[PDB]
Amino acid sequence: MRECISIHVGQAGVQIGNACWELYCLEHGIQPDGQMPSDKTIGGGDDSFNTFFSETGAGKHVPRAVFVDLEPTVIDEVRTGTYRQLFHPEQLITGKEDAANNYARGHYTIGKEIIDLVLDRIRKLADQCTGLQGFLVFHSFGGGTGSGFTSLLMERLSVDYGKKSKLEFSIYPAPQVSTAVVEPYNSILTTHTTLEHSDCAFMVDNEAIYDICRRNLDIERPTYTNLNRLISQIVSSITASLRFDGALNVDLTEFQTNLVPYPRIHFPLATYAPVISAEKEQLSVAEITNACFEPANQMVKCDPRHGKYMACCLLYRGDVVPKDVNAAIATIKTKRSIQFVDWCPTGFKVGINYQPPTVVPGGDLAKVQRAVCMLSNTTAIAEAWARLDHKFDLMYAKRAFVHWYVGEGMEEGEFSEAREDMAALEKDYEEVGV
């Protein structure tokens, strides 16, 4: 059994981290106090759920998690929340003043002041691991901490844990939900600095989550709690294979092996189905599988029909058997525009976990008998890089807001280095995709 350490950075990472660990606890039968009646090995064990939870002699199951924010108000909610007993004080790390939506303030000015403290607290979690496989890092592209401190931590993790895998869940900026005016700048600065250091990154476009919340849950004005509970369901789909018995994606290295043949192009597109309003009809394997190809169920809005596939995994949860998957795949392939790159086999890796998805009691989502998350590495996701790159271009041509970054010690040249990297990234997609 190899352990996974979760790192939640900034507001988006910490609140999404909060949603996930609530879900993990419900899925594993761990109570808010950390007690797990089903775990007959007290004070230890090497079960699959021990990838994410350690154990105390008192039977407490403790997340292998670090929450770090440059400001206290968000992590303070964890310290006094319903799951307060679950976390160690040393796992929650807060600065005093945040990065003011400024990548440079987060990476340079304030990151230099707190990076060693964060790395130390992570060491205390690594030192309890008999075989630590790597990190899951949760953060926004757009925040000052989420972009700037994350990329500093990413650089430092590659140094201090070189042989270890690093996966990202990144909140991609959408004006529908919030957005500082400078979020394109931060998005690109952090991608350029983190590209070398991340093995696989799952982008979640806040516009996709917002729309799914309005359209499929009939929430008029979705909140962060609406957004995060939906996001954490998808995150649970993705991380379930590390936390449960199975054969597909059982260690972080397999995510790269299954989804990322070409190292820079390491952003799989995630599609999730079904999402059903709790206040509001049981979909079939063929129906939920076909929904994986409707653009309205993607975590990033784009058209996969206009790109090429490099890898494709279907992660089922609930009442699903292989016979029904293969039939649905035969049907879909003769009706949908699914074209793979000429240098990769046209195939699906399928995983089934029999436990139906769990929902948060009193949440907006309804219990369903089966659900599926598709992870596909399509060049079509480059649409999202182009949109972002274009907004960067508009502001950078007048150097609007640049002075706040230079004011923190950054050089104007980091901007254009960053942009040129994304120009190269966009081209890598253009070659593989047509």
Added chain:
Amino acid sequence: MYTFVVRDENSSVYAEVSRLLLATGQWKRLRKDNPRFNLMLGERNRLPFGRLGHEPGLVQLVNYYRGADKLCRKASLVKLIKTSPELSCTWFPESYVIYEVFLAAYNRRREGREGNVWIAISSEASELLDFHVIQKYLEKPLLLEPGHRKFDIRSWVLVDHLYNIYLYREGVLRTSSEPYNSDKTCHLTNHCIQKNYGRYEEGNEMFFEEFNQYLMDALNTTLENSILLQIKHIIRSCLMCIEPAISTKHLHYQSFQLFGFDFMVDEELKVWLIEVNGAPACAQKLYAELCQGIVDVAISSVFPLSIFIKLHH
């Protein structure tokens, strides 16, 4: 008040469509690069589909179907017809894309020495390859009288955001003025290539009322029965074939598009598909009526304030 931007200045059709939309006092034209638009009259080339449909609280519509080029590029049409199961195709001339199988079938025509002319117009191969798609030349066209003239038919077809397929009831015959010699002014019917020009009809353009009167008088048949059942068939086959690849049914932005299909009628009153034009112009006499219908069924159906045959609902 709806808002639109204009990104194709050379479009005569959408110059008129914008001139009409403003003329209702309910539409407002913005600068080229304002993203806050309801409708994009976009550019022929490198239209940024990836940036459409991401503006909060804006239904966005564009006048081009992303992926429709697979029909409107000559190499692509041949590939699409050949490899689509739903097209396999008795109305598309034999075609080969070359940058060998050609030669093969060419010899099978040397065998019985039957009509072995091809276009890219030559009679022997090695003169063509020394000079793309090689396409069987239709040696027995239907010739108009008086004049022993060639022609082609241009049909205007509008696909709306619901993927309803509307055929404009006015077509155009683009006729040759020098008689047909079994030199190319009598072989290529292009409206530019002719300007003998202007003899029989104003501008080498015969409209449907007169072609139908002609066919009634000369051949004892109608435009509908002899030709138009076949045209409606080809349009529907072509566009239903690509409907899955290009449709915007559950997409974050919607599409419509005007197409010009080009047909040829041989002397057995069979219709063949020449090519599909993705950014066509209109006949001057029809600009008014057709552009208003674009506004009526493609733009107002999405943004509320028939000269069309429904091929699809």
Added chain:
Amino acid sequence: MEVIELNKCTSGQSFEVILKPPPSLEEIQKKLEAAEERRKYQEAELLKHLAE
């Protein structure tokens, strides 16, 4: 068509279906410290201006 690598357990199963074959701690520290020096320089010009 082909279905390969079927792994069953009590928790679920997995398989593959195939439809058609085919920086150092020093260089970072330098960056960090260079930025901090440019900040220091900019504050020095500021206090130098204010002293004028």
Added chain:
Amino acid sequence: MREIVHIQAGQCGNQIGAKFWEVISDEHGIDPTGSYHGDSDLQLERINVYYNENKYVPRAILVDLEPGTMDSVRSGPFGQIFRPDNFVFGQSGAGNNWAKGHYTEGAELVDSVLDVVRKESESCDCLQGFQLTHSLGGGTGSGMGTLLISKIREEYPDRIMNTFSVMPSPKVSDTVVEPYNATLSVHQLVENTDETYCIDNEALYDICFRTLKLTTPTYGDLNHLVSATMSGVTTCLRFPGQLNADLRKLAVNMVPFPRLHFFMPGFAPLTSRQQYRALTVPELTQQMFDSKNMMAACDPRHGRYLTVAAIFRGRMSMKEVDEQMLNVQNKNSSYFVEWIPNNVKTAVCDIPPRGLKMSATFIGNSTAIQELFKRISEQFTAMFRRKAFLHWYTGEGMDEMEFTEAESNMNDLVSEYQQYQDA
């Protein structure tokens, strides 16, 4: 960061300053004695931003070269809420003379103000910066106020400086030298503030006359408008929300270039010191973007918005707010620069101000603000090309060169706004 340190200087500064503490003390449920008597917990969540603590004392410092206005505060209703040691006054006044406030009389007093400032900044868990209320047309708030801003910046170079600055207008004027004091001050503000709300006494007057139908407004009528605005634009600093804003995030999102940091505030519904009908969300949105609701006498239809922040207060449909805000950008998309995408932002706060069920506040960084600086530049030049009234300043040690420099710098400021209006 949490704490803001508030400074009010001069006659106008202390009057709009006193009204501001009156309004927001009511909103946060703090009585004139400093005791909390409110019913909602949202009232206490971020009270630390503006109050020291079970009595709450405003983190406010009162400054004047004349005892008069401050004495009125100590004898008014809330005068017993301010910390007595935070009153710092002289006796000779500044004679509506920028040079006296900045160089002679104010210099004598400024070190005693910096003492109180230091005392408050040391009780701060994490200081955000400072907000100064003052007018630009007198001498204490104008001349001493900007002298303070410079000295605070020297000792706290890394904290945010923001001001509410009342601009003089001949329609509401105390003396002819106001264009001189204003031009000298704007020069300082361009260099030493991060964000300045431009409150134009001309606009406040026109609103009281033309809209609230007051044939002869007093300074009280104008200051009712100012306090309502000051409560509006600080709503997001003082109340728990989803954005939870602060002075630095405000500067980063609103100021694309360091010099262009002068904001037009706007309020709806505009009220006099009642209509019992609450407004609808379409009405708040149309009114707050109307020029007739702008607190700086500039027509936004004469320039372009660089950035905009809006806040809606009251119980209403967030979906309707979103619908209306996106509508106004469509009907005006020519008035929002294309090189700053998504440059309009919308916040919602549940607690409305006193007396209203709904209200909207607007903060705009619009290039139309050049009209206000062109106005002041004209008035300055009309007197300065004949060296009129100059002796009041040279008699305090000032050379004519300083006037030449300040004028040129505002003219630069105007032209810099014109550059981005055409970009």
